[PDB]
């Protein structure tokens, strides 16, 4: 438990998925 041990995870995760979900926007179904 810490306010930094969790901030490191929230900066690694939710910073990596916010990039893998951004290069997949040009490639997605559109109506």
């Amino acid at each position: 438990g810490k306010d930094v041990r969790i901030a490191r995870w929230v900066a690694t995760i939710a910073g990596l998925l916010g990039f893998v979900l951004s290069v997949s926007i040009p490639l997605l179904p559109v109506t």
Binding site: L21, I25, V30
Partner: protein
């Protein structure tokens, strides 16, 4: 009669709208970007520093230049000229709500502004209130007030106590900002916004270097991305990153002793690549490739080795390159090159920081270089320098002061150069574009004071100044006093002349 039929199938390939999954991804690649930035901020707040004041004490000051610049950009926003691409963009923005996409309205078979049209979707929202000329051009006045507020309070005080303390530098910065913003960045072309993004990026990078944090260096990458997403000529915003990449890497490789490398590299990627979720909101990579194919197969291609056209169009005496359309570039080159040759010789100027002063010149050089590789070679692309020419002129006015250039020969040579630049400026017509050309004094001919041009007068003055410099060269004289009066702040006057 039964049997007859004609069944055409329309090509509606650009009128798309995201599904229930593209929306879920676009509304997530932003939440999980602001969250990454908040985590990076909580990490950066480890050093024990906070914010004591909402407004730094170097901001709460008013000079006689603030009044002049504000009142000269607030009455030129009413009576001033407009660029040649305002009808073009207004016509393409009034119809974008009905068409369903940002269609290029007059050319290329209705192919949209592929990846470079997140800004026109803001004018498409502004046109819902009203499309008057006094209202639809507001982001061109706000992005000038902001540009001045930055250039006069964050950029000049950073360049050292000799650029912040000398009044001639502030006057030169203001007058060159005005002279480079008046003819280019007043219409609807998004050059006044690129010139402000490329300045916010530099300011945020300088703040990161100052405070030693990284959270104002991911916002710099976000600003550079959102500025490059406006137009292909927004590469100045990434030149501002390349110029300030070494002192940022110096903090990336210095903070990682406490937190590691991933919690520092991941948000720098999430903030950098978040521009895709805004560029590809309505369009798609297939339609973007098709539009680009059309635009390159039909419109002006202008391969990179044809970049001399941008300057060939400038020396011709036409409405394209006029008296006012040359200042933005000449007052940048004439203030950049001798300042570079003087920063090379001297390594201690006693009042100028070398880091910021070198980054400011690297930005301009990289911009003037990578202005090639742009799909089109127009003159409107000289409006980018409106923001970074003010600081360059404010640095040159200090570098050529009678206390920094101690020899009268060098100052007289610089005065001759300034007069020659004015002579080159005044060697063309005074024409404006469509209806701003109604009633202009010399809208059709080169200005003449009677028989003799005005460029000839400035050339005959530059020749005399060069002869004076040569006579000070031969006899080895450096203590002349008349040149101390003549060569005191010659750039502010040369810019105020064109502004007036």
């Amino acid at each position: 009669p039964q049997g007859l039929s004609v069944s055409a199938e329309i090509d509606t390939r650009f009128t798309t709208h995201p599904t229930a999954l593209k929306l879920a991804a676009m509304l997530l690649a932003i939440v999980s970007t602001v969250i990454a930035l908040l985590a990076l901020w909580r990490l950066d707040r480890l050093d024990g520093r906070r914010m004591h004041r909402l407004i730094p004490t170097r901001w709460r000051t008013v000079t006689a230049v603030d009044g002049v610049v504000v009142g000269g950009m607030a009455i030129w926003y009413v009576i001033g000229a407009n660029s040649s691409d305002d009808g073009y963009i207004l016509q393409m923005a009034r119809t974008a709500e009905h068409a369903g996409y940002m269609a290029n309205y007059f050319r290329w078979f209705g192919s949209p502004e592929d990846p470079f049209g997140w800004y026109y979707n803001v004018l498409a929202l502004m046109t819902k209130v009203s499309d008057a000329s006094i209202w639809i051009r507001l982001p061109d006045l706000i992005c000038a007030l902001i540009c001045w507020l930055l250039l006069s309070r964050e950029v000049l005080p950073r360049l050292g106590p000799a650029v912040a303390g000398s009044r001639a530098a502030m006057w030169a910065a203001g007058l060159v900002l005005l002279g480079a913003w008046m003819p280019f960045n007043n219409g609807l072309r998004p050059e006044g916004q690129i010139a402000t993004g490329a300045l916010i990026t530099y300011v945020l990078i300088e703040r990161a270097v100052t405070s030693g944090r990284l959270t104002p260096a991911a916002l710099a990458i976000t600003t550079a991305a959102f500025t490059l997403g406006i137009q292909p000529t927004g590469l100045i915003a990434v030149a501002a990153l390349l110029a300030g990449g070494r002192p940022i890497l110096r903090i990336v490789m210095r903070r990682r002793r406490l937190v590691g490398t991933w919690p520092l590299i991941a948000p720098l990627l999430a903030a950098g690549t978040v521009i895709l979720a805004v560029v590809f909101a309505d369009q798609t990579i297939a339609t973007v490739l098709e539009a680009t194919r059309i635009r390159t197969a039909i419109g002006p291609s202008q391969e990179w080795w044809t970049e001399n056209l941008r300057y060939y169009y400038l020396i011709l005496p036409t409405t394209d390159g006029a008296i006012s359309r040359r200042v933005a570039f000449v007052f940048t080159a004439m203030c950049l090159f001798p300042s570079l040759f003087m920063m090379l010789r001297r390594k201690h100027i006693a009042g100028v920081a070398r880091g910021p002063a070198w980054r400011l010149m690297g930005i301009i050089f990289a911009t003037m270089f990578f202005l090639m590789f742009t799909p089109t070679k127009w003159i409107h692309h000289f409006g980018l320098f409106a923001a970074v020419g003010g600081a360059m002129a404010a640095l040159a006015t200090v570098l050529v002061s009678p206390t920094v250039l101690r020899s009268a020969r060098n100052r007289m040579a610089f005065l001759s150069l300034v007069l020659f630049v004015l002579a080159f400026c005044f060697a063309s017509t005074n024409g404006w574009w469509y209806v701003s050309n109604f009633g202009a004094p010399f809208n059709n001919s080169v200005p003449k004071v009677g028989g003799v041009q005005i460029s000839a007068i400035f050339f005959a003055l530059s020749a005399i100044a060069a002869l004076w410099a040569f006579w000070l060269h031969l006899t080895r004289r450096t203590e002349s006093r008349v040149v101390d009066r003549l060569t005191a702040a010659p750039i502010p006057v040369a810019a105020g002349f064109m502004v007036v």
